[PDB]
């Protein structure tokens, strides 16, 4: 029995459905992304690109060039460089 | 022969030459639809030619489901005209025919093993994959699918040219392996 | 049947209005008098350029305009399409047909284009 | 707090203009579509937080002369 | 700030209409007036959502369809609504979905 | 052409807090690494099913052949492994069914193939088209039928 | 008026009450505090949750 | 006396050890994924025999 | 050793704990699954020999000599997957000889 021939792993099929279902992000426009982007700095100062990506669901390219119009990267002894939402 | 191929499908990619609101296509138009999550462009069908187009916002539109060449042309200019109705300064630029699929019958069963074990440079023949034959023809680049039934499916072409030449070439083959 | 289930709607809703009444600082009588209203409301191209060639490529587009017709509102589980066929599992929604009202949960369509 | 930071990047845009001129708060909000009331007076307690460090410069009074170095 | 689904029905316009009535009487705010279309979308939600167990079934031809921000709106003509209790019959339909 | 150090004797070798050998000895190239953790793989695969050694050198030949070809470099490594272990036993005349490739593989039926169909473009070769009698043996044999009805199921599909 | 500013001036004392009533429950387990941490989360929702609304009324 | 049964504990011991921590490590990679990862596929056999 | 040493090593070993590293930066209220694995029930099967085909067969020591092959056994476990999601249902599925 062990290592029966099986077309697709059920886990895998499990995790494909889930992210067919959700989808890809999507492009949102520059003013509600700047919008969200100013209230999740609100919240506290410092934020790391992957959660910010995951706060503002939008495209990891897209938020990178809007992030860098405005926000800049310091580097920190807190772990790493990470960005900085403040424009100054 | 006296077998001629049938057109089953024409993509024909054409630009329009100026840039596009998706969203603003999707709110006006008749039957568009446009789910960014989903995919990038705007999926939009013209029942009287019976084909869908995708739509981006770059001004580039690609147009399927085409039974004829005249059909394709004609659907691509009807969708240009319908962006060009919703205020956009829609063109009809470079139109051409990427892909053409065409379809038709021998009239008898075919050896796939035999065919396989004679071109095996051209034929991929994988039943657990998928059950037609795959032969990829080097003088005309078309790829054709042939079954055991009897039915072939050629896809690749530019030109219906390239289709008949294809079944042309490929005819007397299956002629040396007729079940 | 379904004015029942408008009466337990209309107990919600001003059930959840209450706490925004108070929180805007007006007075209930606001409630009761909405209520009133609303009850009494209710009861060979060689230059291709030019698309002029073609023309009546369209349909009307005051249907949509109008929206005078019976209209259903709901919300969507699943929509498939296989060439020629829509295919329809909307969940809980309302639909008005000639004016009077149909509620239901599981809605399943099939249409042809 | 974050629409802030917005109306610091819109007086960036502002100087971008290069119209700068001696400017006040309600403005502001009026052009960036938000309105004055006691929320315009927490995020002005905010602001004044930012007054006490605006590296982008805004000043109480004739002010938002933000560049160390400007000349044109 | 909601879905904002049931506003453009009988019973959306009917409340809209008493707002509008109050607020010429100036005896709510039209502030008020939007908070109170809120906190009616949020219980009519509920409502159909959870006191609602009957299934339905339609069938007929469709004229158009439409897609953008995760709606629908589909327009079906001669469309036949059949359930096990009843059936209605309607000349054209449009169908507005979200989720 | 390298080298490593081990702990050594217990003096000088652990400093400060414990340096232990100086270092972390940090070898090789990518190009390197990368193919020795799928011929591993490649070995745990072949194991799950217990293929013989020599399918599994075949199978490593063919993943280096691939691997330097690069027409494959955009697929994931596990599935071009996969892929070359199809192909190994295909050319060794043991074939093995996709799914009983996929079973001892996180890569999926349809991965494998078109992996397996770029592999084949690749190398510019073939494999002999599989018969119903290579797979009897097998599936008798998991099965546990007698011999006499293994050879009447084969007869039987010929 | 006058007495709606003395109703205003009650319930400033209610809400101190509330707070500092409990900000020792937390302690026998501030309580302001964490309202006010709250109340921060949740705006970036709100917005994100609300030009929604926007654009589903101009879709429909 | 240590006969083969002691010896081969011994290195039994060691070996199961090292197969649990090669499960530990590799499922803990598709846990941290979302998948939902097979048995089966973590246990290397090879390190046992 | 085979009898009782074998089963008894592998009961010893401490069962597998495992859970996700606060997976989607939500809430996070244990929301990461924890995943729990315990061996069991060790069988031995008698000396096989598997041939290029794939086909298991017994294994005779002579065939061993002469082959140069190893005279060995197979080795399997009874294991127990228990799957906890913080759903308020925890799903103990049972992999029999692994």
Redesign the interface.
């Known amino acids: 029995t062990n290592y029966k021939p099986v077309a697709n792993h059920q886990y895998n099929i499990e995790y494909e459905r889930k992210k067919k279902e959700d989808g890809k992000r999507a492009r949102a426009d520059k003013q509600h992304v700047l919008d969200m982007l100013f209230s999740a700095f609100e919240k506290h100062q410092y934020y790391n690109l992957k959660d910010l990506v995951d706060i503002t669901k939008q495209p990891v390219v897209y938020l990178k060039e809007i992030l860098k119009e405005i926000g800049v990267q310091n580097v920190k002894g807190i772990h790493k460089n990470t960005w900085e939402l403040k424009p100054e | 022969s006296g077998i001629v191929p049938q057109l089953q499908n024409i993509v024909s990619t054409v630009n329009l030459g100026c840039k596009l609101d998706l969203k603003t296509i999707a709110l006006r138009a008749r039957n568009a639809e446009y789910n960014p999550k989903r995919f990038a462009a705007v999926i939009m069908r013209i029942r009287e030619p019976r084909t869908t187009a995708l739509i981006f916002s770059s001004g580039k539109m690609v147009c399927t489901g085409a039974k004829s060449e005249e059909q394709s042309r004609l659907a691509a200019r009807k969708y240009a005209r319908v962006v060009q109705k919703l205020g956009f300064p829609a063109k009809f630029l470079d139109f051409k025919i990427q892909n053409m699929v065409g379809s038709c019958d021998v009239k008898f069963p075919i050896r796939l093993e035999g065919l396989v074990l004679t071109h095996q440079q051209f034929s991929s023949y994988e039943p657990e994959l998928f059950p037609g034959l795959i032969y990829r023809m080097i003088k005309p680049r078309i790829v054709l699918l042939i079954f055991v039934s009897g039915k072939v499916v050629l896809t690749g072409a530019k030109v219906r040219a390239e289709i008949y030449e294809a079944f042309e070439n490929i005819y007397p083959i299956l002629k040396g392996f007729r079940k | 049947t379904v004015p029942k289930l408008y009466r337990s709607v209309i107990e919600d809703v001003i059930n959840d209005v209450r706490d925004i009444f108070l929180d805007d600082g007006v007075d209930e009588q606001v409630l009761m008098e909405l209520k009133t209203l609303w009850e009494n409301k209710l009861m060979g191209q060689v230059e291709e350029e030019p698309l002029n060639s073609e023309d009546d490529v369209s349909d009307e587009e005051g249907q949509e305009l109008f929206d005078t017709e019976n209209v259903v509102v709901c919300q969507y589980d699943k929509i498939h399409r296989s060439k020629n066929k829509w295919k329809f599992h909307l969940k809980d929604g309302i639909m008005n047909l000639n004016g009077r009202d149909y509620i239901f949960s599981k809605a399943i369509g099939d249409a042809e284009w | 707090?974050?629409?802030?930071?917005?109306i610091?990047?819109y007086m960036?845009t502002r100087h971008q203009r290069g119209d700068t001129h001696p400017l006040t708060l309600d403005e502001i909000l009026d052009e960036t579509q938000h309105l004055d009331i006691g929320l315009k007076q927490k995020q002005w307690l905010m602001t004044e937080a930012l007054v006490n460090n605006?590296?982008?410069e805004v000043i109480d009074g004739k002010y938002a002369f933000?560049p160390k170095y400007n000349v044109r | 700030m909601a879905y904002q689904l049931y506003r453009n029905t009988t019973l959306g316009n009917s409340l809209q209409e008493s707002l509008d009535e109050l607020i010429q009487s100036q005896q709510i705010t039209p502030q008020l007036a939007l908070q109170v279309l809120l906190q009616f979308d949020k219980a009519i939600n509920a409502a159909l959502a959870q006191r609602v167990r009957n299934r339905v079934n339609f069938r007929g031809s469709l004229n158009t369809y439409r897609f953008c921000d995760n709606v629908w709106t589909f327009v079906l003509n001669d469309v036949e609504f059949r359930e096990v209790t009843e059936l209605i019959k309607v000349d054209k339909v449009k169908i507005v979905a979200c989720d | 052409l390298s080298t490593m150090i081990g702990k050594g004797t217990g003096a000088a070798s652990f400093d400060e807090f414990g340096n232990s050998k100086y270092q972390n000895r940090r070898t090789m190239s990518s190009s390197d690494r990368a193919m020795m953790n799928a011929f591993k793989e490649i070995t745990t695969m072949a194991d799950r099913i217990n293929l013989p050694r020599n399918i599994v050198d075949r199978t490593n030949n063919l993943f280096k052949q691939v691997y330097e070809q690069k027409s494959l470099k955009g697929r994931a490594n596990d599935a071009i492994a996969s892929a070359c272990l199809y192909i190994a036993c295909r050319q060794e005349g043991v074939p093995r069914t996709f799914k009983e490739i996929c079973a001892v593989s996180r890569i999926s039926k349809k991965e494998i193939g078109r992996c397996f169909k770029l592999i084949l473009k690749a190398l510019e070769t073939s494999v002999d088209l599989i018969t119903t009698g290579d797979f009897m043996s097998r599936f008798c044999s998991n099965l546990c039928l007698p011999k006499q009805v293994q050879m009447a199921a084969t007869h039987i599909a010929r | 008026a006058q007495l709606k500013f003395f109703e205003q001036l009650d319930q400033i004392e209610k809400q101190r009450k509330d707070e500092q009533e409990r900000e020792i429950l937390m302690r026998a387990a501030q309580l302001r505090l964490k309202q006010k941490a709250k109340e921060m989360q949740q705006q970036e929702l709100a917005q994100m949750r609300q030009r929604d609304a926007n654009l589903t009324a101009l879709a429909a | 006396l240590d006969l083969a049964g002691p010896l081969l504990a011994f290195l039994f011991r060691g070996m199961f050890k090292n197969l649990l921590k090669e499960v530990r490590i590799y499922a803990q990679k598709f846990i941290d994924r979302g998948k939902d990862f097979n048995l089966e596929l973590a246990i290397k056999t090879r390190i046992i025999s | 050793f085979i009898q009782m040493s074998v089963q008894r090593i592998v009961e010893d070993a401490p069962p597998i704990d495992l859970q996700a590293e606060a997976q989607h930066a939500s809430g996070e209220v244990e929301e990461p699954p924890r995943y729990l694995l315990k061996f069991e029930q060790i069988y031995l099967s008698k000396p096989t020999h598997w041939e290029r085909d794939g086909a298991p067969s017994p294994m005779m020591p002579n065939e061993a000599r002469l082959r140069n092959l190893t005279y060995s056994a197979p080795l399997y476990v009874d294991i127990t997957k228990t799957v906890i999601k913080e759903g308020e249902e925890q799903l103990q599925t049972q992999h029999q000889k692994t």
């Not at chain 4, 707090?1 to 917005?6: E, I, P, Q, R, T």
Request: glycine share 8%; charged share 30%.
């Open positions: 707090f974050g629409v802030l930071a917005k610091v990047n960036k605006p590296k982008i933000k």
